[PDB]
Amino acid sequence: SQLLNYIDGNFVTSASSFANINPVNGKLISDVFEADAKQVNEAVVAAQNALKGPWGKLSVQDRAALIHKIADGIQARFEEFVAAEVADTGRPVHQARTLDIPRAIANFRTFADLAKTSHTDLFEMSTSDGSGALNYTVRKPLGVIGVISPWNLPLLLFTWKVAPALACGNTVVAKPSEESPSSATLLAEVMHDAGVPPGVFNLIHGFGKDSAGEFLTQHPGISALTFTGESKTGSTIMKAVADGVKEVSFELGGKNAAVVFADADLDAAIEGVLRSSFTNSGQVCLCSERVYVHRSIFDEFVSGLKVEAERLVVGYPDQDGVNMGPLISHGHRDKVLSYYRLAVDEGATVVTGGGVPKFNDERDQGAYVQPTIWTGLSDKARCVTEEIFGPVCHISPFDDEDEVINRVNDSNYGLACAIWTTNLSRAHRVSRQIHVGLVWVNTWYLRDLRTPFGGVKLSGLGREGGRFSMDFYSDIANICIKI
Amino acid sequence: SQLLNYIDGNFVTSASSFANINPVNGKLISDVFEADAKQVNEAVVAAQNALKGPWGKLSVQDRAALIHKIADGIQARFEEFVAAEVADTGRPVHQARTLDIPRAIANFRTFADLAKTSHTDLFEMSTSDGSGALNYTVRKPLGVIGVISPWNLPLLLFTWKVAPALACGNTVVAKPSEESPSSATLLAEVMHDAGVPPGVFNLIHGFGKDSAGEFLTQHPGISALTFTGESKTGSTIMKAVADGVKEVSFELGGKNAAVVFADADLDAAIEGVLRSSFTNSGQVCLCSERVYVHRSIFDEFVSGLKVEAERLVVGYPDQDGVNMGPLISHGHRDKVLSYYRLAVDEGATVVTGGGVPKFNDERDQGAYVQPTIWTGLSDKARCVTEEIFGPVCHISPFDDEDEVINRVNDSNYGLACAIWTTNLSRAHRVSRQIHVGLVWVNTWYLRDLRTPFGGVKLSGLGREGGRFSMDFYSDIANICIKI
Amino acid sequence: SQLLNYIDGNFVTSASSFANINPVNGKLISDVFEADAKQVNEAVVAAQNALKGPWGKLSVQDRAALIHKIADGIQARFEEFVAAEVADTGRPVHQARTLDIPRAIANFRTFADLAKTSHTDLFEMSTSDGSGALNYTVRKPLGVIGVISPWNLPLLLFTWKVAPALACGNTVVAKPSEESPSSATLLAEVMHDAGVPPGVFNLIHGFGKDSAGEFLTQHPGISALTFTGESKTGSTIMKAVADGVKEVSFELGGKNAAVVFADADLDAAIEGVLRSSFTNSGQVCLCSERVYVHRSIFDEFVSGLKVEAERLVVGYPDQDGVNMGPLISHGHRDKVLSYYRLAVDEGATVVTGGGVPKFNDERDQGAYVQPTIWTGLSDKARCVTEEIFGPVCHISPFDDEDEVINRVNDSNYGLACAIWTTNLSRAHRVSRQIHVGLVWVNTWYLRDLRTPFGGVKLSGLGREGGRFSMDFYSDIANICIKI
Amino acid sequence: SQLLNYIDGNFVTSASSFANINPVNGKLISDVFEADAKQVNEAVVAAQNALKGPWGKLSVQDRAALIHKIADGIQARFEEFVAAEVADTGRPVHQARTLDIPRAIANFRTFADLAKTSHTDLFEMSTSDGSGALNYTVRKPLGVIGVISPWNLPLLLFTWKVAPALACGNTVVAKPSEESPSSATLLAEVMHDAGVPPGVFNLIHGFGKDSAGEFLTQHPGISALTFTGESKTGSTIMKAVADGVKEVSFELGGKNAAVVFADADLDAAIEGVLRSSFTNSGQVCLCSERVYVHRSIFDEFVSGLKVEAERLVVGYPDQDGVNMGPLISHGHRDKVLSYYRLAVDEGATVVTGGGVPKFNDERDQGAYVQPTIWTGLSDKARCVTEEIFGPVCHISPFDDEDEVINRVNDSNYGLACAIWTTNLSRAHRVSRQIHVGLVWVNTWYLRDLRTPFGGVKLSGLGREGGRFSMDFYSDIANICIKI
Ligand SMILES: NC(=O)c1ccc[n+]([C@@H]2O[C@H](COP(=O)([O-])OP(=O)(O)OC[C@H]3O[C@@H](n4cnc5c(N)ncnc54)[C@H](O)[C@@H]3O)[C@@H](O)[C@H]2O)c1
Ligand SMILES: NC(=O)c1ccc[n+]([C@@H]2O[C@H](COP(=O)([O-])OP(=O)(O)OC[C@H]3O[C@@H](n4cnc5c(N)ncnc54)[C@H](O)[C@@H]3O)[C@@H](O)[C@H]2O)c1
Ligand SMILES: N/C(=C/C=C/C=O)C(=O)O
Ligand SMILES: N/C(=C/C=C/C=O)C(=O)O
Ligand code: NA
Ligand code: NA
Ligand code: NA
Ligand code: NA
């Protein structure tokens, strides 16, 4: 199996390739051709030229129809996209079938519909001469959008950027994660077969530093760079585009908290924290890695979570009641295990997990770790402050509302928080005080695609979702008519 | 000792001072105390802490009321602010009276009012269990806003950032331009006298690199950096805040065009382009330095503009009938003169101006240049592509509408453009094709503070004005309640 | 052929029927069963009950998909709908094919999309105890919407109401005009076949006074009455629902003007006024029956419009170059011809038309009239002030812009106006001074479904279109949470 | 004392007059001149003319500044306004000082501010020839607004209509209630002294049927009638305006419920129901005349409420700790006492009150009644279904959530509801099911002037508040420019 770049309407190979590895068993899935600087340039130039071709003359309604045809194309190959996402990442098949792929299709449909309904503003004004003036605003395409996406929710996060980019009449050069290149390449096929004009959507494979990603960010031809990934990489990209003053939108890390108050529905909180800590094997930027539980219910909470975490099934993506697959890769598992040892060194009690499961089959050649719960660390421990991106949480007691609010907010990140309480006042009082972009009360990762999505502090720059995406991916121009 | 910093509610001197010079005659106006790194830290820390004090507890209505008291405080000292702006910049007194100071007051009133009226969003959604969920958004203060402003419209541009910063509940550390420090110091006294709590507004004086401006951009304590000035500085600042992923908002250079079609009201277009080229001695980022005129009216337009340009009175701010003051400084004047020589070397015809007037009085020790009009340069000439920021324009003929739109858009900048035509279709057809943030038709620099304002390409990052300011200066947080 | 009512999911007959006549030739097309008071009650009760059934449990996404299925169902029978609308009204087949049916389809898709994208408002407030409160708004179904619709654009106007009613989660009882019952009945079949739950959409046939129309209007079980028709009929309905204080939305008559300024594109204005006067044989509420032309071009306009009007082909719906069909009915034609006589009596010059064409075939038993142009009437003549609703216009000269604005506005109606000018300022200066809900400049009846649509004075009550429809067909409820 | 009409900038008497009675003591406060049909016509004509005068040329900023001067003018006579509202209505001085007068002032400031920030829409569209079109909307004054208002919150409700009417550039003819004419007359003096141009605001005194109220509603020169009062009066007005198809906004009766769930904070709910039942002596449309309390806390609630109700001090507006003043008049007291008798006859148990207090002083000639609580009535009793508009409530037990929702909704009215509960899910789940315009959770009559305010069913037609006012009191016109 081979994964090509898609540049200016053609699938093309490159001089260099790399391996796509299945994290379940360590086996080779495919070879991937790495785009060089020359090919990146060729993509950017093609995307510039496509803005002046047929794509550029489509009405908003016709553009929207064509984006719906993209969505239809993915739906028509639904189970192929499921298989590609599962192979790259080891995610449970049921998750790919119910979240990953349908979200990617819904991304396209939501932004196609938003492109149809969206309008702009009219401002009347008086003038000295008494005849007045009119200011009106219009949305135009920004230009070429460079898209660089991560491996944790491959098609979902890729199409989260590509859908609004296209719905706003932009052209795109997109570089998916080297760990999860498959579903993006299938998306290129769907674009091609749906009649998307050449150069509108281009797909380049590769790495970051000294590869496709870097070259993309350095290219003077782009108008914007949208990115999801690690905070440090965000900082690096922000420096890279600075000489062009390119528009930027970043969704970066977090070290998210969950807070369980004494009035919580306890079993529901246990189940919710189980999901918020261990979904996708802890490899969602939204996962809870720090948990604060009121002292009066702390012991019972920890006990209850231990029992649920030990019933989790860790294994094959299509295994009967599977809850967790492996980590994305052996190198990622190295990092996570390194943090597992660090916690023990910082004085953690390992309530459960803390190692790798023994399967006695091919899974032992994969990148699995156990779901892990810690207790006993101070708020300043490295394991409680640095993003681990694995299936782990630390649980700490608290006593007072104002105290726990300060502890959640004592972080250089600020992406998301989940709070558990049955009390009306507390939900709204406490939520508004958490320094994050996204708070859930009595749930986790419930998404309405119209809402603003983003983080604060190190977790983000800007906001996407609904009209924020329509504003980010558009040139907003103001036209003033003196009457 | 004359202009002090204002930090945590006290005027404070510093270890060194620098001279503030009157560009009308080169005389010393005052000594300005240059904030050092420790003082910049103190200000940022004070601004951090003020977010937890009484300022953080004010209702939106009470905050708005206090901002209106700031406005009223400026108004109460109106003629002092006029004299300060005039002294620093040499602006004609009638212009500081009618444009600069009143706009600064209007900035505070508008954003105070937007703060009281602005609301957020409610999204209802269905869930699996049939009970639904609610997502709602709220605006909160972003944090500490660092404000770095230019010398060309000192109080106007400084308050354009400070007013929405404060209206959104933030605290501020603001660094005015070293060339025009006086009005911003008076503003500090107004804040003090209105009872703004300590730490909420802090003024620091100094330069950029290795001085107060650079220190502010590098401080990890700010949440955002808003800047107006040269594109090159914008790039430097973007790199500096990168490691912190600070929110950024930039209004940068342009090389703006005016276009005059054959069906323009010729007299009105001549007067309009005279204003657009020579207002504030050509020192507005919105000024036209490139003018394109349909060949049928080219000679008449040029002849007319020469006549009107040579009637401009260049002189004292309180001189009878004065139209233009000096440039901001001798250093700026040397840069503009360096372009006046370069234009001649690149082959220009000097229609008028091209040097410095000879006053035979103390004005010869100031920083005056003549209003200049060039003809005969090619589109790739440096004087037609690089921002000069003086009272100059090049006039070129054109023949076809698609041609002139290409020539307007063939620029690394994209701030603003002015079009002159009486034809309904052409106005709207042409305006939407110009790749800028702001187009005026049959006028120039008509401002409605509700409109989105900014540039594209090198001319900017983001938008401000109306709801775009309210969104930039706020954290937008989404709270999701499972029902 | 017989046309049944559709009540609670079943097609049902009634004790009485009335004839549906083809206005082309006077032949019987079908018998239509008239709903009595008991059946209207049954439809209302069914509609009330369906709000408590499955319909009321659908998510907005699922409701929207069902409404898209209605639209697809129309599209799948597109040519049957075309044939139906043509048979009832005599409209040219190509007009039914390009305007009427595609717009009915688009009505459904537009409002389905709006239902998915629309959201409500979140208002935060401070309280005396310092804890604050939240106000959030929600859109709920208003309840049972009664829809009464006219014969001039039967399916388009019927669906213009039914689509947002359904999209907002309401149930409907709809009474189409007795002159054009066929396409509505067909729509009831599409509804049935698409699986719309019983009682959600009910169709009742009949007349107004002393019939289905009036009974619907009097039923205490409805929550709103939306209506398009004669202003006098609006007034009657407003009286009828007053005791229940029902929500009302009315789009009523007009006596619309076109204004042609001296700088108009003359041949384009001639063609535009031809269309605005004689489309659908002048039977559109938006038609121009008053035309004002600048004195300097009056004679040449009148001359040119005469020639174009006499080239119109008046004939069979599928006849080769056909432009106009008959009037809707003999009764309407009696009324139009009465005005034709009145005009001559009031002193008109008949420039063209003024009678009935003579075909010497079966069309002579239909309801045809000639396209007619008058001159020479004063502004007070009844033929110039009262709505005729036939293919007629009166042309008068003017000299001065303010004068013609006054003469346009001197009316008890205020639906629409069309202005012809090539001048940028005039277009905007004049448009804003016309006291109507809709102005077109250099075009007529160009529709964007997001815009507010409606009239002033006797021409309307309320606005519909875009968010205006979403607000009218919803209960907007405010919920205030003390924190 | 005499109260004059204010018509075209002059105070004028009439041929007929009526007595304004102080309800504390039955003494004559003033004689009021009753406008006749000719005076009403004179006011409407003057309002129509003033739309073409200096008022119509004000910029939105200058109009807003003039509206703020009206507000300032009220504030400068603050104690006079307080004395006037007290004299007319008997309302406690403390509450006129803190609710009534301050709210009237805030109505003007809020709508003045909205007027300055409000803007309209721009819609871009494709056309067949590829050139496109623009639709933009503008807000214009609707015309002459007729304002008819009730006696319960005289200045607050009067200004709630007058402020947005004026802020939207309309002119006004206003008829305050015959029972509370004083503060409105004072307001005409403030308008006059603030320099409001003659004819912009006209005040006419009189009654409803066969008097100034009716004459206004029949006058063909008005563009809109906004009304607050009894439902049956709304129905009558809606018939009166029907032949002109005038725009109408009605805020009408309610029979509002409060619901106290078992998990409510009990003492807070008692205090809250006390306020919601007996504020302004129960003469607020928003008052709770029906209370439902969960069975498990019913007896304890009734007992607590009994105690609080008997601690209320009923007496002079300026008496020490007065809580309640008299009813508005003797005629209204006769109606309320009639209901107090009916309740006994319907089987009610009188927990407290039920008659009139005994003062043995001039208050015996007033219109006082006692705070009254009933128990024991069925859901169909007249006293539980009909609006009494006095200081009374009936308390009833309930068992189940769905049950109480059905019972609250089982009404021909639908204005407001208050719910008491500490539970997050319950609050949001139950609130959205209550068929009213306004739900308060854990509070009552908490007002944010931006929110939509209105009722459903017999309780109203339309919404006012924030943008809903700006939309009602403006003509929204759509201008379509073909490019
Ligand atoms: N887009 C707009 O709206 C707009 C408006 C006005 C001015 N401008 C641009 O502003 C320029 C005005 O000139 P200027 O010479 O004041 O610009 P500048 O960029 O040299 O200086 C602007 C400010 O930045 C500070 N500064 C300079 N170097 C810095 C550094 N390394 N770190 C941090 N702060 C630093 C300065 O002290 C000053 O306060 C022109 O380019 C003009 O077009 C743009
Ligand atoms: N927002 C609301 O829903 C709201 C608010 C406050 C009061 N109210 C209602 O107010 C009522 C108490 O007020 P009210 O007794 O003053 O009501 P009312 O209806 O008898 O009269 C109110 C106003 O209407 C005038 N009026 C009476 N009959 C008229 C007619 N035929 N034509 C024209 N005008 C006429 C009166 O002179 C007075 O100015 C209660 O029903 C209460 O629910 C409703
Ligand atoms: N649903 C989403 C999950 C995202 C995680 C990081 O963005 C999203 O981003 O849209
Ligand atoms: N505060 C208010 C009370 C209104 C009661 C009836 O309208 C209001 O209307 O603003
Ligand atoms: Na992989
Ligand atoms: Na200076
Ligand atoms: Na018919
Ligand atoms: Na009275």
Rounded to whole angstroms, the Cα distance separating C10 from C4 reads 9
Neighbour-count burial for D451-474, b at 16+ CB within 10 Å, e otherwise: bbbbbbbbbbbbbbbbebbbbbbb
Rounded to whole angstroms, the Cα distance separating C125 from C129 reads 12
Can you list the alpha helix ranges (DSSP code H) found in C370-423? 382-385, 401-409
Rounded to whole angstroms, the Cα distance separating B143 from A456 reads 10
* Cα nearest neighbour of A424 on chain B: B481
Is C438 close to D477, i.e. CB distance below 8 A? yes
Neighbour-count burial for C113-131, b at 16+ CB within 10 Å, e otherwise: bbbbbbbbbbbbbbeeeee
Q: What is the nearest CA distance from C453 to chain D, expressed in angstroms?
A: 7
Half-sphere exposure (Cβ direction) of B105: Cα atoms closer than 13 Å: 18
Furthest-apart CA atoms within chain C: distance in Å:
87
Ligand 1 atom with the smallest distance to the CA of B177 is: 39
Rounded to whole angstroms, the Cα distance separating A263 from A257 reads 18
The reply to whether C247 touches chain D by the CB within 8 Å rule is: yes
| Domain extent for B231 | 1-253+449-483
Rounded to whole angstroms, the Cα distance separating D435 from D457 reads 9
AA letter at B325: G
The reply to whether B483 touches chain D by the CB within 8 Å rule is: yes
Rounded to whole angstroms, the Cα distance separating D15 from D35 reads 8
Rounded to whole angstroms, the Cα distance separating A50 from A201 reads 9
State CA D75 to chain mean position distance: 21
Q: Is D116 helix (H, G, I), strand (E, B) or coil?
A: helix
Encoding tokens for residue C307? 């020639």
Decide: D251 in ligand 2 pocket, CB within 6 A.
yes
Pocket test for ligand 3, best of A95, A155, A160 (most atoms within 8 A of CB): A160
Smallest CA separation from ligand 1 atom 44, residue: B252
Detail the residues of C annotated as belonging to a binding site for NAD(+). 149, 151, 175, 178, 209, 229-230, 233, 251-252, 335, 387
DSSP state of D453: B
Q: Count the Cβ atoms, other than its own, within 10 Å of residue B194.
A: 18
Cα→Cα distances C444→B180, B293, C284, C303, C427, Å = 55, 34, 12, 21, 14
What phi and psi values does residue A391 have, to the nearest 5 degrees? -85, 75
State CA C94 to chain mean position distance: 19
User: What dihedral do alpha carbons A208, A210, A212, A217 form, nearest 10°?
Assistant: 80
| A64 and A111 belong to one structural domain | yes
Encoding tokens for residue A430? 């406490």
Cα→Cα distances C22→A155, B196, B261, C415, C455, Å = 57, 79, 56, 30, 31
Is A443 close to B482, i.e. CB distance below 8 A? yes
Which ligand lies nearest to the CA atom of residue A3 in the structure?
5
Pocket test for ligand 3, best of A447, A451, A464 (most atoms within 8 A of CB): A447
Of B479, B483, B482, B432, nearest to B135 by C-alpha is B479
Of C317, C296, C160, C321, nearest to C227 by C-alpha is C160
Identify the H or E element spanning A464.
none
**How far, in Å, is the centroid of ligand 7 from the Cα of C40?**
22
Is C439 close to D463, i.e. CB distance below 8 A? no
The reply to whether A124 touches chain D by the CB within 8 Å rule is: yes
Of A8, A6, A4, A9, nearest to A20 by C-alpha is A4
* Cα nearest neighbour of A135 on chain D: D122
| D245 and D258 belong to one structural domain | no
Given A131, A429, A450, which is nearest C483 (Cβ)?
Answer: A429
| D471 and D392 belong to one structural domain | no
Rounded to whole angstroms, the Cα distance separating A474 from A458 reads 25
What phi and psi values does residue A160 have, to the nearest 5 degrees? -55, -35
Rounded to whole angstroms, the Cα distance separating D191 from A140 reads 47
Smallest CA separation from ligand 3 atom 9, residue: A157
Given A57, A121, A424, which is nearest D422 (Cβ)?
Answer: A424
Rounded to whole angstroms, the Cα distance separating B256 from B253 reads 9
Strand partners, D19: D31
Can you list the alpha helix ranges (DSSP code H) found in D100-194? 101-117, 154-167, 182-194
**Which residues, including other chains, have CB under 8 Å from residue D205's CB and lie 6 or more apart?**
D3, D5, D14, D32, D33, D34, D35, D175, D176, D178, D181, D185, D212
Detail the residues of A annotated as belonging to a binding site. 149, 151, 175, 178, 209, 229-230, 233, 251-252, 335, 387
Rounded to whole angstroms, the Cα distance separating A373 from A393 reads 5
Detail the residues of A annotated as belonging to a binding site for NAD(+). 149, 151, 175, 178, 209, 229-230, 233, 251-252, 335, 387
Smallest CA separation from ligand 3 atom 6, residue: A285
Encoding tokens for residue A420? 């558990």
Which ligand lies nearest to the CA atom of residue D154 in the structure?
2
Provide residues with CB under 6 Å of ligand 1. B 148-152, 175, 177-178, 207-209, 213-214, 217, 228-230, 233, 236-237, 251-253, 285, 387, 389, 415, 455, 459-460
Cα→Cα distances C325→C70, C284, C317, Å = 29, 13, 6
The reply to whether D134 touches chain C by the CB within 8 Å rule is: no
C251 in active site: yes
* D19 Rama sector, left if φ>0, alpha if ψ -120 to 50, beta otherwise: beta
User: What dihedral do alpha carbons B455, B456, B458, B462 form, nearest 10°?
Assistant: 70
Which ligand lies nearest to the CA atom of residue D461 in the structure?
2
| Residue whose structure tokens are 């052209």 | A171
Can you list the alpha helix ranges (DSSP code H) found in B370-456? 382-385, 401-409, 424-431
Is D446 close to C239, i.e. CB distance below 8 A? no
AA letter at B276: S
Strand partners, A141: A474
Detail the residues of B annotated as belonging to a binding site for NAD(+). 149, 151, 175, 178, 209, 229-230, 233, 251-252, 335, 387
Given B243, B432, B462, which is nearest A479 (Cβ)?
Answer: B432
Contact between A456 and A439 under an 8 Å Cβ cutoff? The reply is no
Rounded to whole angstroms, the Cα distance separating C206 from C46 reads 19
- Alpha-carbon dihedral sign for residues C99, C104, C107, C109: negative
**Which residues, including other chains, have CB under 8 Å from residue D406's CB and lie 6 or more apart?**
none
Given D223, D436, D441, which is nearest C482 (Cβ)?
Answer: D441
Smallest CA separation from ligand 3 atom 4, residue: A157
Contact between B174 and B204 under an 8 Å Cβ cutoff? The reply is yes
DSSP state of C35: P
Strand partners, A480: A135, B440
Edge-to-edge, what's the strand order for the sheet holding B171-175?
Answer: B10-12, B5-7, B201-203, B171-175, B144-148, B224-228, B247-251, B460-461
Encoding tokens for residue B432? 């939407």
What phi and psi values does residue A287 have, to the nearest 5 degrees? -65, 150
Rounded to whole angstroms, the Cα distance separating D439 from D288 reads 12
Residues of chain C positioned with their CB less than 8 A from the CB of B122: 119-122, 136-138
Is D421 close to A425, i.e. CB distance below 8 A? no
Rounded to whole angstroms, the Cα distance separating C473 from C462 reads 12
| C264 and C248 belong to one structural domain | no
How many residues are recorded in chain B?
483
Residues of chain A positioned with their CB less than 8 A from the CB of D120: 121-122, 124
Q: What is the nearest CA distance from D290 to chain C, expressed in angstroms?
A: 19
| C172 and C155 belong to one structural domain | yes
Parallel/antiparallel/unpaired status of strands B288-294 and A288-294: unpaired
The reply to whether C268 touches chain D by the CB within 8 Å rule is: no
What phi and psi values does residue A29 have, to the nearest 5 degrees? -100, -45
| C143 and C159 belong to one structural domain | yes
Is C424 close to A481, i.e. CB distance below 8 A? yes
Contact between D440 and C136 under an 8 Å Cβ cutoff? The reply is no
| C91 and C156 belong to one structural domain | yes
| D188 and D269 belong to one structural domain | no
With 0-12 CB in 10 A as exposed, 13-18 as middle and 19+ as buried, what is D482? buried
Domain count along chain A:
2
Encoding tokens for residue B425? 């279709």
Contact between B226 and B249 under an 8 Å Cβ cutoff? The reply is yes
What phi and psi values does residue C58 have, to the nearest 5 degrees? -60, 140
Angle among Cα B147, B151, B156 to the nearest 5 degrees reads 65
| Residue whose structure tokens are 């990148």 | A367
Rounded to whole angstroms, the Cα distance separating A192 from A198 reads 8
The CATH number assigned to the domain holding C468 equals: 3.40.605.10
Positions of E strands within D211-246: 224-228
| D281 and D179 belong to one structural domain | no
Contact between A459 and A252 under an 8 Å Cβ cutoff? The reply is yes
| Residue whose structure tokens are 């994969």 | A366
Of D325, D423, D424, D411, nearest to D366 by C-alpha is D325
Q: Count the Cβ atoms, other than its own, within 10 Å of residue C265.
A: 15
| B326 and B346 belong to one structural domain | yes
The CATH number assigned to the domain holding A378 equals: 3.40.309.10
| C99 and C59 belong to one structural domain | yes
Residues of chain A positioned with their CB less than 8 A from the CB of D421: 424
DSSP state of A52: T
Smallest CA separation from ligand 3 atom 10, residue: A160
Strand partners, B480: A440, B135
Q: Count the Cβ atoms, other than its own, within 10 Å of residue B44.
A: 24
Smallest CA separation from ligand 3 atom 1, residue: A447
Strand partners, D397: D293
- Alpha-carbon dihedral sign for residues C36, C41, C42, C43: positive
Residues of chain B positioned with their CB less than 8 A from the CB of A439: 477-480
Edge-to-edge, what's the strand order for the sheet holding D28-34?
Answer: D2-3, D28-34, D16-21
Cα→Cα distances B228→B225, B372, C269, Å = 10, 26, 49
Is A428 close to C134, i.e. CB distance below 8 A? yes
Given B234, B250, B452, which is nearest A476 (Cβ)?
Answer: B452
The reply to whether D361 touches chain A by the CB within 8 Å rule is: no
Positions of E strands within C288-369: 288-294, 349-352
The reply to whether A424 touches chain C by the CB within 8 Å rule is: yes
The reply to whether D478 touches chain A by the CB within 8 Å rule is: no
Cα→Cα distances A272→A304, A309, A451, B130, C242, Å = 12, 12, 22, 18, 53
Decide: A308 in ligand 3 pocket, CB within 6 A.
no
Parallel/antiparallel/unpaired status of strands D144-148 and D171-175: parallel
Given A61, A136, A423, which is nearest D424 (Cβ)?
Answer: A423
Cα→Cα distances B483→A436, B135, C111, C481, D428, Å = 21, 11, 28, 15, 7
With 0-12 CB in 10 A as exposed, 13-18 as middle and 19+ as buried, what is B267? exposed
Q: What is the nearest CA distance from C127 to chain D, expressed in angstroms?
A: 9
| B316 and B207 belong to one structural domain | no
Q: Is D480 helix (H, G, I), strand (E, B) or coil?
A: strand
